[PDB]
Scaffold this active site. Sequence first.
Site, mmCIF file in Angstrom:
data_model
loop_
_atom_site.group_PDB
_atom_site.id
_atom_site.type_symbol
_atom_site.label_atom_id
_atom_site.label_comp_id
_atom_site.label_asym_id
_atom_site.label_seq_id
_atom_site.Cartn_x
_atom_site.Cartn_y
_atom_site.Cartn_z
ATOM 1 N N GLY D 55 -4.749 3.316 -8.208
ATOM 2 C CA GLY D 55 -4.748 1.886 -7.984
ATOM 3 C C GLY D 55 -4.672 1.106 -9.268
ATOM 4 O O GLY D 55 -4.195 1.607 -10.290
ATOM 5 N N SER D 84 -5.209 9.062 -10.232
ATOM 6 C CA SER D 84 -5.229 7.802 -11.009
ATOM 7 C C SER D 84 -6.619 7.176 -10.998
ATOM 8 O O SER D 84 -7.595 7.867 -11.291
ATOM 9 C CB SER D 84 -4.232 6.835 -10.436
ATOM 10 O OG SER D 84 -3.524 6.276 -11.506
ATOM 11 N N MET D 85 -6.685 5.892 -10.667
ATOM 12 C CA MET D 85 -7.991 5.190 -10.722
ATOM 13 C C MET D 85 -8.973 5.897 -9.793
ATOM 14 O O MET D 85 -10.172 5.587 -9.871
ATOM 15 C CB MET D 85 -7.843 3.732 -10.283
ATOM 16 C CG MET D 85 -8.088 2.735 -11.391
ATOM 17 S SD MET D 85 -9.515 3.176 -12.403
ATOM 18 C CE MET D 85 -9.231 2.151 -13.844
ATOM 19 N N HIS D 109 -3.242 10.958 -14.782
ATOM 20 C CA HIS D 109 -2.017 10.499 -15.408
ATOM 21 C C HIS D 109 -2.283 9.162 -16.068
ATOM 22 O O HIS D 109 -3.191 8.428 -15.679
ATOM 23 C CB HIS D 109 -0.877 10.386 -14.400
ATOM 24 C CG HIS D 109 -1.117 9.370 -13.337
ATOM 25 N ND1 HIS D 109 -1.883 9.626 -12.225
ATOM 26 C CD2 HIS D 109 -0.705 8.090 -13.221
ATOM 27 C CE1 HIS D 109 -1.928 8.548 -11.466
ATOM 28 N NE2 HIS D 109 -1.221 7.601 -12.049
ATOM 29 N N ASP D 158 1.878 13.442 -14.892
ATOM 30 C CA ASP D 158 0.961 13.920 -13.870
ATOM 31 C C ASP D 158 0.333 15.244 -14.266
ATOM 32 O O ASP D 158 1.016 16.169 -14.701
ATOM 33 C CB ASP D 158 1.695 14.060 -12.545
ATOM 34 C CG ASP D 158 1.978 12.728 -11.903
ATOM 35 O OD1 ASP D 158 1.205 11.781 -12.145
ATOM 36 O OD2 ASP D 158 2.965 12.622 -11.149
HETATM 37 C C1 LIG Z 1 -5.268 4.372 -12.970
HETATM 38 C C2 LIG Z 1 -4.616 5.064 -14.154
HETATM 39 C C3 LIG Z 1 -5.312 6.385 -14.434
HETATM 40 C C4 LIG Z 1 -3.113 5.275 -13.962
HETATM 41 C C5 LIG Z 1 -2.399 4.507 -12.833
HETATM 42 N N1 LIG Z 1 -2.547 3.060 -12.970
HETATM 43 C C6 LIG Z 1 -1.563 2.239 -12.602
HETATM 44 O O1 LIG Z 1 -0.411 2.628 -12.441
HETATM 45 C C7 LIG Z 1 -1.920 0.783 -12.341
HETATM 46 C C8 LIG Z 1 -0.747 0.089 -11.646
HETATM 47 C C9 LIG Z 1 -1.167 -0.721 -10.449
HETATM 48 C C10 LIG Z 1 -1.663 -0.102 -9.314
HETATM 49 C C11 LIG Z 1 -2.056 -0.847 -8.215
HETATM 50 C C12 LIG Z 1 -1.955 -2.215 -8.237
HETATM 51 C C13 LIG Z 1 -1.465 -2.844 -9.356
HETATM 52 C C14 LIG Z 1 -1.071 -2.102 -10.457
HETATM 53 N N2 LIG Z 1 -2.256 0.109 -13.571
HETATM 54 C C15 LIG Z 1 -2.597 -1.177 -13.591
HETATM 55 O O2 LIG Z 1 -3.265 -1.721 -12.716
HETATM 56 C C16 LIG Z 1 -2.119 -1.951 -14.781
HETATM 57 C C17 LIG Z 1 -0.807 -1.850 -15.201
HETATM 58 N N3 LIG Z 1 -0.354 -2.529 -16.255
HETATM 59 C C18 LIG Z 1 -1.240 -3.306 -16.873
HETATM 60 C C19 LIG Z 1 -2.546 -3.407 -16.454
HETATM 61 N N4 LIG Z 1 -3.004 -2.731 -15.403
HETATM 62 B B1 LIG Z 1 -2.794 5.022 -11.333
HETATM 63 O O3 LIG Z 1 -3.615 4.007 -10.613
HETATM 64 O O4 LIG Z 1 -1.550 5.259 -10.544
#
Ligand SMILES: CC(C)C[C@H](NC(=O)[C@H](Cc1ccccc1)NC(=O)c1cnccn1)B(O)O
Lengths: 178, 178, 178, 178, 181, 181, 181, 181, 181
Positions: D55, D84-85, D109, D158
């Site tokens: 997320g 992820s999160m 990841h 990943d």
């Molecule tokens: C969490 C870490 C470990 C890696 C991944 N994070 C992301 O891709 C998420 C992308 C996302 C997911 C859901 C809603 C909005 C944005 N990262 C972010 O929230 C994000 C992205 N760019 C700048 C600041 N925050 B995972 O959630 O796929």
Amino acid sequence: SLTDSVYERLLSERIIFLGSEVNDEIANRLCAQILLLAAEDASKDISLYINSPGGSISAGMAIYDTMVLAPCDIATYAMGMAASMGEFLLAAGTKGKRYALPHARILMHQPLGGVTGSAADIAIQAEQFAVIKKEMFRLNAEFTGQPIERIEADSDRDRWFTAAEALEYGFVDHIITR
Amino acid sequence: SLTDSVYERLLSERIIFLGSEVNDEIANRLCAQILLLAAEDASKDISLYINSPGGSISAGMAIYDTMVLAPCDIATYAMGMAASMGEFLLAAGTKGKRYALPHARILMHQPLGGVTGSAADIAIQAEQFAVIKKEMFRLNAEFTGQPIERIEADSDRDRWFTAAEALEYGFVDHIITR
Amino acid sequence: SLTDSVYERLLSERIIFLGSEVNDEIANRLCAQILLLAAEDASKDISLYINSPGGSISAGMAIYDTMVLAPCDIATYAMGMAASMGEFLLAAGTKGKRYALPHARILMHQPLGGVTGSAADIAIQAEQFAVIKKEMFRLNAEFTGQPIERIEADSDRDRWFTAAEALEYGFVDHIITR
Amino acid sequence: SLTDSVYERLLSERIIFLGSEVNDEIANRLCAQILLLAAEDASKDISLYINSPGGSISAGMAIYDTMVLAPCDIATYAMGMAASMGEFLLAAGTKGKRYALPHARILMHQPLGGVTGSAADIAIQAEQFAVIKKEMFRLNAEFTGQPIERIEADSDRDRWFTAAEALEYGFVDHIITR
Amino acid sequence: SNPYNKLFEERIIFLGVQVDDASANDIMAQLLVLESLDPDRDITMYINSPGGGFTSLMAIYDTMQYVRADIQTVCLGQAASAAAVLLAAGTPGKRMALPNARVLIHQPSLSGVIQGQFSDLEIQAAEIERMRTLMETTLARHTGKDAGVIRKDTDRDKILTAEEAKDYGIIDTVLEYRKLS
Amino acid sequence: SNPYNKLFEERIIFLGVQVDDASANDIMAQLLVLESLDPDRDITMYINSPGGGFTSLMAIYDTMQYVRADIQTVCLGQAASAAAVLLAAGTPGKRMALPNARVLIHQPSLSGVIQGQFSDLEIQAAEIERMRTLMETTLARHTGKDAGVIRKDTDRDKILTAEEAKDYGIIDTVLEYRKLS
Amino acid sequence: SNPYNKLFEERIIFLGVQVDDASANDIMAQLLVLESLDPDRDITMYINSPGGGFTSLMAIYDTMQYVRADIQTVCLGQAASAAAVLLAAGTPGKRMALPNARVLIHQPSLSGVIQGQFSDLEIQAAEIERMRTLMETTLARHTGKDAGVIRKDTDRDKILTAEEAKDYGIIDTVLEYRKLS
Amino acid sequence: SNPYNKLFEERIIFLGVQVDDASANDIMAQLLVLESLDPDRDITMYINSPGGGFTSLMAIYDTMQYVRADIQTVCLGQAASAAAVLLAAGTPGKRMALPNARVLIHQPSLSGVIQGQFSDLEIQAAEIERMRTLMETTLARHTGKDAGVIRKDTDRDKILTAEEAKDYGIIDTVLEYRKLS
Amino acid sequence: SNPYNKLFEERIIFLGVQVDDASANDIMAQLLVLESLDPDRDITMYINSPGGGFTSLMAIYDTMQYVRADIQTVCLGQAASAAAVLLAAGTPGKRMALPNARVLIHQPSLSGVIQGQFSDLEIQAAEIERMRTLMETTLARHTGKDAGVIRKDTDRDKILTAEEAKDYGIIDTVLEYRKLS
Ligand SMILES: CC(C)C[C@H](NC(=O)[C@H](Cc1ccccc1)NC(=O)c1cnccn1)B(O)O
Ligand SMILES: CC(C)C[C@H](NC(=O)[C@H](Cc1ccccc1)NC(=O)c1cnccn1)B(O)O
Ligand SMILES: CC(C)C[C@H](NC(=O)[C@H](Cc1ccccc1)NC(=O)c1cnccn1)B(O)O
Ligand SMILES: CC(C)C[C@H](NC(=O)[C@H](Cc1ccccc1)NC(=O)c1cnccn1)B(O)O
Ligand SMILES: CC(C)C[C@H](NC(=O)[C@H](Cc1ccccc1)NC(=O)c1cnccn1)B(O)O
Ligand SMILES: CC(C)C[C@H](NC(=O)[C@H](Cc1ccccc1)NC(=O)c1cnccn1)B(O)O
Ligand SMILES: CC(C)C[C@H](NC(=O)[C@H](Cc1ccccc1)NC(=O)c1cnccn1)B(O)O
Ligand SMILES: CC(C)C[C@H](NC(=O)[C@H](Cc1ccccc1)NC(=O)c1cnccn1)B(O)O
Ligand SMILES: CC(C)C[C@H](NC(=O)[C@H](Cc1ccccc1)NC(=O)c1cnccn1)B(O)O
């Protein structure tokens, strides 16, 4: 909900709202409310408030039939807009009990519809459009007290009324001023 | 819901919100709430709070008619935005009870609409647009106390006000500072 | 619901959430909650928690006006994200009561909008965009204690802060560490 | 509902679920639940169960901040998927209380995002992407106990883990076997 | 023959449409043909373009810098984004613009969001940064500005009137009307 | 040959479509060809356009002001928005209009909303303001009005009948029917 | 050559499609070419159009009134809305119609809603009113009606059979079949 | 030359597509050219059309009744709705149809709903009624039926096989196969 | 010339596309031209069609039965629905098919739902029933089956391999490969 709980509390005070386009859902909701309030007290007035852009003829004729056949006197209130089936149900209230709030605007116009299908279907629809438009104009002539030749002339296109113009025309009997 | 339960608890404290675009659904909800609160206590003030981007003229005239015809004094509150029908209902409050919160912004502009249909339909719409715009400007001249020639000049296009500019113009009577 | 029942139980403990984009629906929900909690206890703090990607200026000015005019001290909490109108309402809390949780990130940027219509409409919008941007920067200069020339320089584009960077900049007064 | 009533009954037993993508709605729901359960009993463990495809970073940092700042020990449970999160909040549990159910799979990841706008906007986003990715990798290095150079090498693309691989890597402290 | 075929006989190419790869490959094909027909006669390049495209910009930037013929750029109504770089890319002493033509110099952008991991977005941003520096280094060797001045000026949209585009150095002459007309 | 090819042999260009960049580059290519074929013979420009476009307006405004030939504009049924400026942009003594042609002078607008930060919208509004002043300065040197009069007149849509477009100064002659027809 | 090229050699233009700006600029280009080829020989104009468009109507209304040649209009199957005005716009003594052609005279409308402030809608309605009076003034000088009669008649759709379109004055002769065929 | 150009040299027009205004103006242009090439030689009209259109029907109904040449209609696979009226509209003694061609006579309809006030719908229904009577009056003078018989028969879809379309009077001969083939 | 023009010089028409009215009018125009070029030389008709269409089927069924020339049908890869009827519609002794061509005989269907009252649906179903009997009567006079056998066989899809399409009677010879190739 909230908006359903406020409407339910006004329904306890016998105040129902026609607040949408008069379709079969809002009409059957009002016809249910008029039948429910005429079953609680048959001798106490029902205060229908019209804020309506018009609607279906047969939906409004369902309301108008339940307004007449209820033993209650349906006091109607033009609240902002009584257009089309809204002006019809406004003028359908009990005489002496049709009110316009002072900045309500009453739109009187002939019914809109749509012809569809084969030329034998359309000749039946237009035969019935002449029946509906004659009965709508007969009842507006009965409600307002205007001649039916004036009703069909004014309600050729949109014929807007203020609260004071609808008072002298005959849709409402008073203008609420408190 | 949650947001309906908080609005219901403020409705018990006679605080209603105009928080959306003034359409017929929000207007009939407010007109129901003004009729419900004027039926509980006829002598206690109703605190309408305006956070509105404007809305329909006939929807706001329904609210304005129920604001006037209620025996309660409708205290109005510009809360963030009173744009279009929101400034109208803001300025429609009881004199001495029209408030602006200090960072609310009041947008005054002439009514928007749309012409449609044949040239005989449009000539009726524009005849009625001149009636609506004259009555909207007459009431803004009545509310603010400005001349109607100044109302029609300022409300030609968007005419933004701060809480202090709307105080000296006449929409609000005070600015809440606590 | 479940999520509305947990929010209702935190509302009993005077903890409200700004958890979405600040539009007029969430603002009027928070303004209702601030008015409801300031009516229960006028002397007990309200713990607003900000997890917001920003939102409307006039929606957040509605919240900011109800945060100031409430007799309660609105303790604010940057919870994950306090961007745009979220950092504004974060920094709008009572001095000594603006908190950032240690991994919240504060985005400070000038207001976004959109110009529309004719060149006389746009010249009024840009006149009002200069009013909104000056007042937004004046209040961020008042909240943080930074000069308004530094506020307009940092908030030219996106200006991200950590919880420790926003502490020394002035958005928050403490960082919660338990 | 049914599914909200079962979640409410587990909330009475201090078992909350992260069961969706971590967006601001689910995060503010969990942050509300962690604040609500830390207000009931400050000394009893909260059993967060992670079935999450990942997320938002700032949404999960809101949860992670409320997990740390709660006086309760947040026991976390990888239930099927902690990607992820979801793996971040899994590894964010109290040491000795991070569990994986034996067939849960942990996806590690680097954060995904998106660059947008002008080259001065993107240079700020990438400056902030380097801040977020460094802090995400610093905390995964703090949670797992791995070096941050190994965290940034494994979490380049990943990096899937079983329950036994995540145990030796450091995300979870035990594997539930009953 | 069209008018467009007639202007090309007199060694005039229209930019006209936005600078995408389809338009860039057209202009490069036109610049190389006009180089081969007469390499010592000035190609004129009419620019009414809303810009767009950086690789398509630098495709027809490099070609109008490559060819043996001097390039005379003329801004017709608009030179935005890439087009303004192509407008400055004419030969010095050339580079006309009509008196009511606007010149919109502007830093490179991404049309819409491109997703990816942060290690993939650090590269798309190091590219849009070197696209920005290349836009400013190109526009500094043709306007005589100091390339940090252009970074300050193209930080937002800088719409230049033709009279203040020759003060900026984008064009050289705001070309006068021939007969009152 | 088409009729459109036949009118162009007699040095007549249709505006016809709305003034966008595709139409402006067509008309500029036609105006420069007709300048090169005979620079001392009057180009006629037929205008039935609904307007639109300002940079595309000032592209073919400047070109019909540039060329050696005098431009005779003829409003056919409509000259709205930008096309009314092009109608006034003909040579004085020229600029006909048919008797039932409407001329719609109109201040510049934005088709739809353009988003951005307020510092980016202060520039898009300083541009639509200088597009407004340039629309009024252009329309004042061709109608003989005082450019604040045009700001008062083009504040809303001002639809001019051809008989009251020569009283306004947009055209010079409402041209009479040749045979009763 | 097409049939359409063959009819144009015999000085016949089809209206055929609805009267929009694309069709009006075609017919104006055809009317001016046929005026230049032989200005004293009657252009015939075949009308099978569903109408539409007022500025495009008055573009090809004014052109068929402008040209030196007399215009012979022939309604084929339909002259609705604007095309009935063009049908009456032929030369008197001309203006045929086939016996089963319907002629639909009709007051001007707005296709769909146009939004705006009321001060902007008072102008769009003063325009659709003067479009209505111009439709009735044009149709009165060509039918010999009194222009308030046409306001009463075109208040709704008035579909005229060809035999009752010459009684109305729209056409002059319902033209007979040549051979039984 | 196409086959379609080759059949037109032998004075054969295809209906082929549905009868809309685009197809009607094609067939009217073809019928008038073939009238001018040889007015005393029979135009053949091949009909494989699904019908549609009434004003486009009566455009090419009236033209094939106008022209000096006799019209020979041949139904290929289908003459539905309007095209069955055109099939009967051939010269008597002509009007062939292939043995497995279906002829679908059918009362006029409205494709989709047309909205409006009831005073506007009383006119659209008085028109679809006179379109119905004109469909039946036309089909009675060409089949020899009594026009109330056709109202009873076209009250629903009446699909006629070619052998029972000559019993109905739509065609005259179901034309035999030349060689067994 | 194309290959398709070259095969038509050798009197070969492709069915190729599905049998709709556009394809049927093409094939009928090709069959009548090839009848007129040499009526005593066999037209070959190559069929790779997925079928579709019944009136378009019986348009080119009747034409290939009409013409003076014998028709040689050759199924290339597919003759489905209407095209299998056209494959059997060749002259006996002709009607080849390539060895891996499938022949899909199939009862008529309605593509999608057609709405209406039940008295209108009793007629659309009496038509799809007589389309079914006509499909079976046609396919019985060309295969020698008993037309109730075909109703039992085309009750579902009956995909025939070419070797079992000559056992069925659809084709006559599965034509052998000329050189091993
Ligand atoms: C969490 C870490 C470990 C890696 C991944 N994070 C992301 O891709 C998420 C992308 C996302 C997911 C859901 C809603 C909005 C944005 N990262 C972010 O929230 C994000 C992205 N760019 C700048 C600041 N925050 B995972 O959630 O796929
Ligand atoms: C009511 C009278 C005065 C005039 C207008 N009536 C109508 O246009 C309505 C149109 C409508 C509206 C909503 C839903 C369905 C149909 N009339 C009818 O309902 C109608 C139309 N044709 C035949 C029978 N009834 B008004 O409602 O706009
Ligand atoms: C209050 C006035 C002076 C200013 C603006 N009013 C209007 O534009 C509104 C437009 C609107 C808004 C919401 C729903 C339907 C229609 N005016 C009307 O309601 C309206 C429009 N045409 C004729 C009669 N009334 B406000 O809504 O921005
Ligand atoms: C807080 C400021 C400094 C920055 C941003 N705020 C705004 O400008 C937002 C932009 C927005 C938000 C939601 C919906 C539509 C538009 N405020 C506004 O609504 C707005 C936009 N233009 C003029 C006045 N107010 B942020 O909240 O995204
Ligand atoms: C001023 C010059 C440098 C060109 C300006 N911007 C660019 O450099 C253009 C703008 C653009 C156009 C189409 C799609 C995406 C982005 N940049 C690019 O072409 C581009 C291509 N790949 C990666 C990054 N940027 B113009 O388009 O505003
Ligand atoms: C009257 C003359 C000046 C032209 C009129 N308006 C304009 O100036 C036109 C209207 C328009 C057309 C297409 C897209 C957006 C805006 N203005 C522009 O072209 C324009 C272009 N970029 C920024 C601002 N305005 B016309 O289009 O109403
Ligand atoms: C009878 C003659 C005057 C033409 C009839 N109506 C009109 O005048 C036409 C109808 C129409 C067509 C297309 C788009 C909008 C409106 N009116 C116009 O063209 C028109 C154009 N701008 C403003 C107002 N009306 B016809 O189209 O019914
Ligand atoms: C004998 C023929 C005319 C009968 C049937 N055709 C029609 O009635 C056609 C079908 C149609 C096409 C367009 C719009 C509405 C209706 N009718 C008309 O052309 C038509 C046109 N305007 C008003 C009324 N009917 B058939 O083609 O289904
Ligand atoms: C086997 C032969 C008879 C043809 C087969 N089916 C048909 O007869 C076709 C199938 C079809 C194709 C296109 C659209 C609708 C229906 N039937 C018709 O064409 C058709 C047409 N009008 C009414 C009823 N059926 B084939 O298309 O499967």
